[PDB]
């Protein structure tokens, strides 16, 4: 037996530095667990208030910019977080978007970052059960 | 002209495959995708290539998520007009592959997204 | 308040550079991007930063793909209105850098995609 839902929706992408100066991780595996733990805590706290849980897929990365602006040679250690508003769990896309933005700001604070990006992209989600 | 890209997220089912690292689980999914993409190409003459990335997916521990996230793989690809003449048939093929990956990886659930994109291909 | 993001996928040419791990190949591509982006900024006043991710790309072994996939790097970035005034010129700059990366990495083929996105920038 099987079920499939298709619909138009939004995905998000967030990019954050990982302040090695403060957290002292030794590998991309370790920094992935660091950010995963922080996200898990803040997402749970928000869900308990609003009944909106924002799950995130987290990927290891480095971000390259001008060394004159503080970038290490070959790039700064970063993590990329992405997720989609699944109609199985989301009834109001505007409130979901507001929740993502709030979580992005909290992550910026917890990771002690000067700057952070949060993007929304239109997507067609097929969800299989 | 516009085309489509796809993105799939899958678990790696340590209970069934018993991988010991993110490197090993990346190669596992790579090999499975290679087999199922070839099998579909033999039927339809459409080959769907995939870029695969290591990841962890974070959700509520009450729903079965490990502490700090579940080991996952992200697969993405694009409909390249060099190889694709019919976008509808390509889309149908991706959906078939997404279902087959869900089956082969023994996953309860699976996401497959389509996004509009403008592809520049340099050869 | 829409802008564009880009995605590039490149091989890492073990035949030429002889890297021994995904960590080493990530630093290789990062260093090359850093140099070419700086050079272009000095000419055009457009700096294209990139997020770089480790990956493998899976295609038919009959076409040269290793078993379980080819080692690749994925580069993404977004046109931030804080720094960019003209989206057409930014896109032209990305395309030039994508071609230069193809040349420096000695790749036969390369993809560069553009996707519409809504950027929130927090400072
Ligand atoms: C790697 S798959 C594992 C879980 O990983 C998350 N996940 C999977 N793919 C994605 C994706 N592309 N982007 C973001 N998160 C994703 C999802 O939370 C997914 O949960 P399932 O869809 O499998 O739901 C299983 C059950 O868990 C509950 N649940 C899961 N997510 C939510 C949620 N967001 N809100 C409420 N309930 C939720 C609900 O009972 C549901 O039937
Ligand atoms: C990392 S580059 C390596 C290969 O990796 C795959 N690839 C590269 N970039 C991407 C990307 N963004 N998303 C998904 N797959 C990608 C492609 O399959 C690519 O093949 P090439 O474009 O280099 O074609 C090489 C030759 O191989 C054949 N070929 C490659 N792909 C297909 C195809 N899909 N259908 C038919 N023939 C195909 C054909 O002879 C072609 O001239
Ligand atoms: C991991 S955050 C680190 C740096 O990483 C880059 N970065 C962050 N998120 C992303 C992303 N999603 N995609 C691509 N690059 C990104 C950005 O270059 C960022 O720079 P900041 O926004 O923090 O600016 C810091 C300062 O650096 C200068 N600056 C940074 N980027 C540019 C730029 N593109 N052009 C000119 N000046 C730039 C400017 O003075 C600014 O006040």
What CATH number does the domain containing A58 carry? 3.30.70.2040
The experimental method behind these coordinates is: X-ray
| Whether the Cβ atoms of residue B111 and residue A126 lie closer than 8 Å to each other | yes
C109 falls within a domain? yes
CA distance A27 to A40: 20
E-assigned strand segments in B3-82: 3-11, 50-58, 70-78
Closest Cβ–Cβ partner in B54, B102, B114 for A128: B102
What is the token pair recorded at A20? Answer: 């090695």
Instruction: Retrieve residue B48's tokens.
Output: 């769907």
Cα separation values, A68 from A22, B11, C13, C121, Å: 22, 41, 29, 21
Distance of alpha carbon A64 from alpha carbon A79, whole angstroms: 13
CA dihedral A99, A104, A105, A108 (to 10 degrees): 160
Q: Would you say residue B123 lies in a domain? A: no
CATH number reported for the structural domain that contains residue B110 in this entry? 3.30.70
Instruction: Examine residue C42 and state whether it is found in any structural domain, yes or no.
Output: yes
Question: 3-class DSSP state for residue C100?
Answer: helix
The pairs formed by B24-30 with CB atoms below 8 angstroms and a separation of 24 or more are B25/B54, B25/B71, B25/B73, B26/B52, B26/B54, B26/B73, B26/C56, B27/C56, B27/C68, B27/C69, B29/B73, B29/B75, B29/B105, B30/C56, B30/C58, B30/C68, B30/C69
Q: For A36-58, b where at least 16 C-beta lie within 10 A, e where not — what string?
A: bebbbebbeebbeeeebbbbbbb
Give the Cα separation of B53 and B76 in Å (integer): 9
The atom number, within ligand 3, closest to the CA of C121 reads: 22
Residues with Cβ within 8 Å of A84's Cβ and at least 6 positions away in sequence, in order, are: A9, A10, A11, A12, A123, A125, B111, B113
Q: Are B88 and B94 in contact (CB under 8 A)?
A: no
Q: How many angstroms separate the CA of residue A68 from the nearest CA in chain B? A: 30
Name B121's Cβ contacts closer than 8 Å, sequence gap at least 6: B80, B81, B82, C109, C110, C111
Comparing alpha-carbon positions, the chain C residue that sits nearest to A106 is: C122
Q: Does residue B106 lie in a domain region?
A: yes
Q: How far apart are CA A102 and CA A45, in angstroms?
A: 12
What token pair was written down for C12?
Answer: 């890492």
What does the alpha-carbon distance between residue A1 and residue A48 come to, in Å, rounded to a whole number?
Answer: 33
Name the residue with tokens 């979901």: A96
Whole-angstrom distance, CA of residue B70 vs CA of residue B64:
9
How many angstroms does the Cα of residue A74 sit away from the middle of ligand 2? 28
Cα separation, B102 vs B8, whole angstroms: 10
Nearby residues of C64 by Cβ (< 8 Å), 6 or more positions away: none
CA nearest C33: which of C19, C47, C20, C21?
C47
Number of domains in chain C: 1
Residue nearest to atom 28 of ligand 2 (CA): C63
Write the DSSP symbol of residue A114: S
Residues of B in contact with C113 (CB under 8 A): 5, 78, 117-120
Q: What is the secondary structure of C46-76 as a DSSP string?
A: ----EEEEEEEEE--GGGTPPTT-EEEEEEE
Q: Which helix (H) or strand (E) holds C116?
A: strand C110-122
Nearest atom (ligand 1) to Cα of B10: 1
Of B57, B95, B99, the CB nearest to A55: B57
Q: How far is the CA of A55 from the centre of ligand 1 (A)?
A: 7
* Domain span including residue A17: 4-128
**Helix axes of C22-44 and C87-104: crossing angle, nearest 10 degrees:** 130
Q: Three-state SS across A39-103?
A: HHHHHHHHHHHHCCCCCEEEEEEEEECCHHHCCCCCCEEEEEEEEECCCCCCCCHHHHHHHHHHH
Is B90 part of a structural domain of the chain?
A: yes
Residue C57 CB coordination number (10 Å): 23
Q: Tokens 């993001």 sit at which residue?
A: C5
Q: Determine the angle formed by the axes of helices A28-50 and A93-110, rounding to 10 degrees.
A: 130
Helix (H) or strand (E) holding B46: none
- C-alpha A112/C-alpha A22 separation (Å) is 9
Q: Is residue B121 part of a domain?
A: no
In a domain, C123, yes or no: no
What crossing angle do the helices spanning B87-104 and B22-44 adopt, rounded to 10°? 130
B 53-92 residues with CB < 8 A to C: 53-54, 78, 80
Could you give the CA distance from residue C36 to residue C47 in angstroms, rounded to a whole number?
10
Q: How far is the CA of C121 from the centre of ligand 2 (A)?
A: 35
Residue of chain B minimizing CA distance to C7 = B119
């Amino acid at each position: 037996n099987a079920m499939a839902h298709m619909g138009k929706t939004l995905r998000f992408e967030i990019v954050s530095g990982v302040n090695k100066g403060y957290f002292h991780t030794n590998s991309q595996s370790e920094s992935l667990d660091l950010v995963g733990g922080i996200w898990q805590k803040i997402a749970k706290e928000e869900f308990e208030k609003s009944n909106i849980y924002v799950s995130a897929v987290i990927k290891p990365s480095k971000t390259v910019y001008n060394q004159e602006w503080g970038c290490p040679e070959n790039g700064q250690e970063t993590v990329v977080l992405t997720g989609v508003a699944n109609e199985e769990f989301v009834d109001d896309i505007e409130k979901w978007k507001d929740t993502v933005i709030k979580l992005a700001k909290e992550l910026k604070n917890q990771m002690k970052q000067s700057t952070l990006t949060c993007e929304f992209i239109e997507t067609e989600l097929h969800y299989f059960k």
